[PDB]
Design a protein around this ligand. Structure first.
Ligand SMILES: Nc1ncnc2c1ncn2[C@@H]1O[C@H](COP(=O)(O)OP(=O)(O)OC[C@H]2O[C@H](O)[C@H](O)[C@@H]2O)[C@@H](O)[C@H]1O
Ligand SMILES: Nc1ncnc2c1ncn2[C@@H]1O[C@H](COP(=O)(O)OP(=O)(O)OC[C@H]2O[C@H](O)[C@H](O)[C@@H]2O)[C@@H](O)[C@H]1O
Ligand SMILES: Nc1ncnc2c1ncn2[C@@H]1O[C@H](COP(=O)(O)OP(=O)(O)OC[C@H]2O[C@H](O)[C@H](O)[C@@H]2O)[C@@H](O)[C@H]1O
Ligand SMILES: Nc1ncnc2c1ncn2[C@@H]1O[C@H](COP(=O)(O)OP(=O)(O)OC[C@H]2O[C@H](O)[C@H](O)[C@@H]2O)[C@@H](O)[C@H]1O
Lengths: 80, 401, 400, 390, 400
């Protein structure tokens, strides 16, 4: 209503499962554009995780299927 | 003296109709300058009469040289203030453009003297404007009754009432601050009040799960609002406003430079920097474009083009009902029959002759006044009478009648 | 005075019948040349008087040589105008083929005069036909009430009313425009307005209205014309008056195909007329739907096609009609004595049926347009059971 | 010369981006007088030049006695030909009220001349303006493509496209009429057309064929105010036979507060009412979520429109594409001390730092016809002539 | 010689095309005066030869006095026979109206010869016209096959086949009454037949759960329709018509009644007879304005203007298909290529050159006759192609 506004964030997915050093991620669909400007659509890259106090760093490993759904697998290497 | 769709109906049918209307989803009221006549205010006719008898030489110059006011209208009191103000503004603009000097200064004095009379008539209490508890006096009893009646008639899950007006006075603000109700008018803060269009979409809520509130739209500005050089609008209290900039307007002369914002003009689209004016009218046009709507009009003179056009165009909606109060209906009909009549009278006669059962017009002289209009509105019926023994009561009574 | 199914009916039951007949799914009206007498219009009896007064030598030529019109029939003002146009056309066509020059001009003159007299009777306002805001006058008062009453009795989800007429004059358009309501008649465009048959399948909808109807002119209009390209265009009153109407009215120029109207008995002579067929297909499709009501007013019952169609719609057990015929008893008596014209036999046949779906009204001046409009009811806003009110009067009746 | 916030782009990325934007809900197009030059139009500079060298004997009084024209701007061909008409109307009204017979006759000649130059440059077909099927010609070929591909791309359940325009000519009307679709411009009726602001909330449907909305921000040739305080609209032929003909083929004559083009008689409360509605509708549309806008032909000579355009960018969902041909010649001036306010505004729009504005420049590369090509893609004569041959 | 937009296509492609158009929503057939020549009929130029060889005395007065026919046409056998009878009736009517006694005999004597000539060619069986079970003879073997093939390839929830014709004889009725099919033609009754135009919207259904019926539109009348003294149109049986008026027409030499008969398109000036003719044309125009129509034409000479005009206009709809048989392309292409032939040739050759896929023309002499038309049509898989019933009927008759 007044001036104060809070949220400004731009991600590409959200964590959906943890299986003993192995992370599952679901990729967004309804976003007309994931533009903010960098986009990650390929294995080998590095991704980050906002845990409120620290930043956790991981590394992409796989992509596959199953408006359908897309999934990604990653592994963790350290924190900042 | 009550018509509906061209025909005629009596008192009891009218009262049942008025009871039915207050049960709908949306209800609103539009007030004019004649509603605040019983509190201490006065109409434009009185403004012209007090103006002509205070500055004789300026009036003489208006009539003689500039030929803006006819010699007949001054004596019969038919001069229109808004059109005169607009014409003087146009003269000033061309005089500025052609770089003449004497005429521009001549018009400045007229334009300043005309605002002083307008401002003095909106105080409603004279010297006691800069005091507290002004709503405790008996002059504001029917405003309090109107506010109490409007809110009590709602049901859970329904929306609060809305109030539109074209006055500059504080009668309706003074009345509510004595009941403890909250009116939302688009401002926030205390040590610095500013206008935000976004906060017309706010409501209360209770943390453990102040339930009375309403809205107020001022179409022609207010006597308290003033615009700063940074293109923002601020609001103060009555005491501070009287003590800082409307004691120099009244007592002392030649001191008007956009000190506070009002719209006494006929053409209000010319001002290309007033966005409050465009904000209010958008909400007004949005309100009457909804299903199941009722509107009550009182005190309006039907001499404004934009409002007439808006009201006329909303009548093609099959869920819109209006009730219009107009004291001098007989004279309007009589004068229109002869092929004459003022531009305001043709508009009101045209509405009365429509064939749709969604328009109702009330005449009668002193029966269509403000104090009479409040008395028509119903009181809520709490606990709809349990059981059906009222039928037995009516039998027992009426059989001996 | 009022008959239903052959028996007699009273006024209160007639009003109760008319009220409950306006709740059905389909409602329509069919108007004739009498519904515009109160506005400035004329009938076919006045055209003959004007013709026989203005042109006194062509009448002698008709009576003496060609024997098309008899003396006694002309004296009593009982000669059909439509049936004379066809005979004159036949004579002209025969004379043209055998290469006769003198006998070809007189029929041209007769047709031009007879077409000129018909045109004058449809302006309704004389030279004021070209001005604007013609619907504000007091003459067009009951057309407005008719449209308002018809259009306000429509629950959401139903279909809009339909109006059919055989007049060339612009009474309904003038009335409705001053009221602010839109009518669909199959045309579209402003700079180039053209007839499209598929424009009858459209309707309004709200993006986030509801006051409109349809209009079918069965015998053409006075602002329609065909530019020979198998297309039909429509223009405004002022444009038509400046283009061709003025020349016909004043300059006595020879008539040509300036504007397409259909006065005459046989309407199928014209082969490239594709609007008449579309109108009659839409008319015939309307009366075959279930739960329909139709009110007829001003129609003189002298058209073969139309009353041929009306009879065939009584084989549907969900169709109802109400017919307004002022001079009922005079038609009633003449049939028993040997019979009148074919016009008066049709109404007597219709009256004597045995189905509770045909109602005939007579009575002279109480079966007029103004009488018709006031019978239609107003919608009831905020309905309530009101049972306790009748309980109170059922108390008071015994209290009496 | 394609820029995006100070960067550069190639053709293919832009051609993909414009397609990507077109898959939105609210899509709109804003035009200007630049789109009328391919059919027989002009510009402000051209008409000003034509005015100077046809009426030079009265140019002095606009600078000596009444101070309406800046001498530098007159010698520079940069004056704005809209406010001049408004101020002339104000001056004439004041003079007529004062009953100054000597000075009343001065401004009528000026207005008569200005309207002659204004009308002469908008017929687009000369003496053929009154005839029929004028939208069938080859000149009005590119406009039909825009409407066709705007209608076709929209999915079922999407809103209809909206069109805003600064032109006051009958160009899109002919194109739509000869295409076979209906546009809502805010009027209704045939024998008396009247302006109802609430018709903009209407839509067709099938009882068991499309439409679009057209806004004119500066009026049109076919609007006028009669004795009654109401606004009317007529056809092309009726307007030609009523008032347009005399304005072009007569020496000196003037009517008064009659015409509603361009932005002329704003001093009356009946004529400003229509002007306000279009502007407020544009403002309300432009401030909605998930909208697009394809500006073309607009020279940014209006102070008020830029104020609204800039402010709406605060939401992240407002996308703008601009087509400004002479871009570098403005940058060169901007580096120097000189320039003009439109140039300063456009270069400020160039030097932004976000991926929402997309300026496009060049020569013939940034014209109206090229923009038509960028947007995606969506024997009857033989039968007609065979039928007519029978 | 098969063309589709100018490109020649072989036989198998044509057959696969015909197979695909027979399974659309709407299917129709138009037949002319050449389609009944295998039963005992004659073409239009075989009638003119008989007339001008039998009555050489009226031919001089009908050319040199009343200008009703040209010399070039009557020399080349290009007379429109049913367009002359209408004009003759008009002439006789006007002469009767204005009472010119000498001119009535000259037309009552030639109208008695024109009917005596055209009537005799439409009996198809001579003196056996009044007998029963005429559909069991071998001349009507292919009409049955056409009707049987048209009905057997419709799926449930689809319309019925429609058949139009310009022949006014009784071949199709006799063929259909032998299979047991029922054809609707607008008449109902037995002791008084009457014309009810609204029953073209009726259909049958089965009360237990049949679909064996079709529509027949006769564009130029019939031998069995006539107008009695009252103004209603009646229909009788072949025996009854023969005993009432046909015998005297064929035998007696001074027999002419008046505006009585309703063939071929004659008494059009009357306003109760033109009503019958107008409905057939209105419904023909309505049929071909539908989304998925396919129409076959065979036996037609393209010598008419209104039908050609209607057919041309229906092609500006992307889902209307036409197939045309004309056994004379070779003799017309050259005559048009050199200098230009007649209107029929010009029409057909302008249609042939069109660059559509929606037009197909077939030629080649006997390869495009009526008999060849039938075998191009499909044949259902489950349709019984054997003979079992007849053997049992023979055994039953032999018993006792
Ligand atoms: N006690 C009363 N109660 C109700 N109505 C009354 C009373 N006394 C008089 N009236 C009626 O009140 C009606 C209006 O009085 P006017 O002052 O002419 O109304 P306006 O047209 O100026 O409207 C006000 C604004 O309109 C403009 O835009 C300016 O901004 C004005 O300030 C009359 O019909 C009275 O009979
Ligand atoms: N004020 C009145 N209100 C209602 N009905 C009236 C009134 N005055 C007379 N009538 C009745 O209105 C009727 C008028 O009879 P006619 O003039 O023959 O009306 P039409 O439209 O059939 O004639 C038009 C012809 O031309 C067209 O092309 C059609 O084909 C027609 O053949 C009579 O019953 C009057 O009593
Ligand atoms: N062929 C072309 N293709 C593309 N752009 C062009 C072309 N030709 C010119 N341009 C560009 O288009 C521009 C158009 O020049 P002006 O006529 O001044 O622009 P407007 O009509 O939009 O401004 C007038 C409005 O603004 C004020 O408020 C007025 O009062 C009006 O309301 C040229 O300068 C070129 O940059
Ligand atoms: N066995 C045959 N099979 C098929 N076609 C044949 C056969 N024999 C001849 N033909 C062809 O059949 C055709 C005979 O054409 P005609 O009888 O003169 O024309 P119409 O039947 O339209 O005549 C009536 C029309 O006259 C007015 O125009 C009205 O419109 C009427 O409808 C020729 O092409 C022959 O080659």
């Amino acid at each position: 209503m007044s001036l104060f506004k809070l949220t400004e964030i731009s991600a590409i997915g959200y964590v959906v499962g943890l299986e003993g050093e192995r992370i599952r991620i679901n990729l967004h669909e309804g976003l007309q554009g994931r533009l903010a400007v960098s986009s990650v659509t390929q294995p080998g890259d590095l991704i980050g995780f906002d845990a409120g106090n620290i930043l956790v760093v991981a590394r992409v490993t796989d992509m596959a299927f199953v408006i359908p759904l897309r999934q990604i697998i990653a592994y963790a290497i350290g924190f900042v | 003296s009550i018509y509906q769709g061209g025909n005629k109906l009596n008192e009891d049918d009218f009262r049942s109709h008025v009871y039915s209307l207050c049960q709908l989803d949306n209800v609103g009221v539009l007030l004019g300058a004649g509603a605040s006549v019983g509190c201490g205010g006065k109409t434009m006719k009185d403004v012209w009469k007090s103006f002509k008898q205070n500055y004789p030489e300026l009036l003489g110059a208006l009539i003689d040289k500039y030929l803006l006011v006819s010699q007949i209208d001054s004596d019969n009191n038919l001069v229109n203030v808004e059109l005169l103000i607009d014409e003087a503004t146009k003269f000033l603009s061309v005089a500025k453009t052609r770089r003449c000097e004497d005429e521009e200064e001549e018009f400045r004095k007229i334009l300043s003297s005309l605002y002083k009379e307008v401002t003095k008539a909106a105080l409603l209490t004279g010297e006691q404007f800069r005091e507290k508890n002004q709503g405790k006096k008996d002059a504001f009893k029917y405003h309090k009754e109107l506010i109490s009646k409007l809110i009590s008639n709602r049901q859970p899950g329904q929306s609060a009432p809305a109030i539109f007006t074209t006055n500059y006075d504080l009668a309706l603000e003074w009345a509510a601050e004595d009941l403890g109700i909250q009116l939302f008018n688009g401002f926030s803060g205390l040590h610095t009040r500013q206008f935000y269009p976004q906060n017309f979409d706010l409501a209360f809520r209770n943390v453990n799960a102040g339930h009375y509130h309403a809205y107020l739209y001022k179409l022609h500005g207010s006597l308290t609002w003033y615009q700063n050089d940074s293109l923002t609008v601020n609001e103060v209290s009555a005491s501070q406003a009287y003590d800082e900039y409307i004691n120099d307007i009244i007592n002392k002369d030649d001191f008007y430079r956009g000190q506070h914002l009002i719209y006494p003009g006929a053409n209000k689209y010319s001002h290309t920097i007033g966005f409050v004016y465009g904000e209010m009218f958008r909400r007004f046009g949005e309100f009457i474009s909804k299903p199941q709507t009722a509107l009550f009009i009182n005190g309006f003179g039907f001499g404004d083009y934009h409002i007439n056009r808006i009201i006329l165009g909303a009548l093609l909606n099959p869920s819109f009902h209006v009730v219009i109060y107009y004291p001098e209906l007989k004279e309007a009909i009589t004068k229109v029959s002869k092929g004459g009549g003022s531009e305001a009278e043709k508009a009101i006669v045209t509405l009365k002759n429509m064939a749709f059962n969604q328009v109702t017009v009330v005449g009668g002289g002193s029966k269509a006044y403000f104090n009479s209009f409040v008395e028509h509105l119903p009181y809520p019926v709490l606990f709809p009478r349990d059981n059906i023994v009222d039928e037995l009561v009516e039998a027992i009574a009426n059989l001996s009648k």
